[PDB]
Amino acid sequence: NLGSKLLVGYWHNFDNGTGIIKLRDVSPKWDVINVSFGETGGDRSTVEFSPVYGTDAEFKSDISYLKSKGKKVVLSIGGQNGVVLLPDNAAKQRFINSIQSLIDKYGFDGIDIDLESGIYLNGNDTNFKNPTTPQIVNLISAIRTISDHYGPDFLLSMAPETAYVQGGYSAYRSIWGAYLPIIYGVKDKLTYIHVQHYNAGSGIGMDGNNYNQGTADYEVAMADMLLHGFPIGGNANNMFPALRSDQVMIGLPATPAAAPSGGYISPTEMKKALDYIIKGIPFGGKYKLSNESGYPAFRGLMSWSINWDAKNNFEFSSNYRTYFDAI
Ligand SMILES: [Cl-]
Ligand code: NA
Ligand SMILES: [Zn+2]
Ligand SMILES: [Zn+2]
Ligand SMILES: [Zn+2]
Ligand SMILES: [Zn+2]
């Protein structure tokens, strides 16, 4: 079964300067490998994926080998080429069929939704429990259909930026809060969400205070929105519900170069945030956690990326594997 404290790492299906790591050479400290990325061509709906090294059959066998060792391998849909546009049923079906074909071909354990294309609320799409924007409605439907095809053990994750989730605290329009209807719409099938707590600037917590990315207070404040639920757009009558704590992870850059505009946090400071979130132990931050005792089943950390971590001699993976193994 899938563990209670996870390290989820993005795996580059490309060389961005940090090199390509073949699947069998990925550190065993990662519990889940998010293969980056499934992409689309002209129809912006049929997802395609070809491994950057070797044959398709060899990649399929590498995945089988990792799965035999208890690891999960997930296909991430996103990046610049992971444009998925679902304006109608036809596009939705192409997306569903192509994803199912890839899962079957390579033996992926599930999918990671790392999309931004078309993810913005139409004017007048104001109810997160009943969205009307076709892109959003169709994406929710497709995710539920794909998930159903594989059953309750299908691994579904999502990695939106903060504007699309916690940004909903300030406004519910355009991009702000636009993942909220997606999250709500698939919450019964969502294994975990790892919001990207980086390339974000600052975030307003439920206490009304602004916190800077890369600080312990920010990590706690942003995660707490999902652990506790929050009022959308300054309206106490429009409450976004809490997720299960086992559905909440925090996404972090593995090193500063992985997120140039900011978001990297030192292990010393992040362990303070983790101790507060998980164990209810405060550290002298300004942010007061919603729940006195913490959220022991908080699911863990995601990182951009396995490749960046390796170029930084595994600082991130080593520090947090040790931290979680010690609980
Ligand atoms: Cl809990
Ligand atoms: Na290839
Ligand atoms: Zn279902
Ligand atoms: Zn099938
Ligand atoms: Zn973005
Ligand atoms: Zn409460």
UniProtKB/TrEMBL annotation:
Zn(2+) 4 binds at H228. Its EC number is 3.2.1.14. This is chitinase. It comes from Bacillus anthracis (anthrax bacterium). It holds the Pfam family Glyco_hydro_18. Zn(2+) 1 binds at D104, H149. Belongs to the glycosyl hydrolase 18 family. The keyword NAD does not apply. GO terms for biological process: carbohydrate metabolic process. The keyword Transport does not apply. PROSITE patterns: GH18_1, GH18_2. Residues 5-327 form the GH18 domain. Zn(2+) 2 binds at E116, E161. SUPFAM superfamilies: (Trans)glycosidases (SSF51445). The gene is chi36. Keywords: Glycosidase, Hydrolase, Metal-binding, Signal, Zinc. Zn(2+) 3 binds at D148, K189. InterPro entries: Chitinase_II/V-like_cat, GH, Glyco_hydro18_cat, Glyco_hydro_18_chit_AS, Glycosyl_Hydrlase18_Chitinase. GO terms for molecular function: chitin binding; endochitinase activity; metal ion binding.
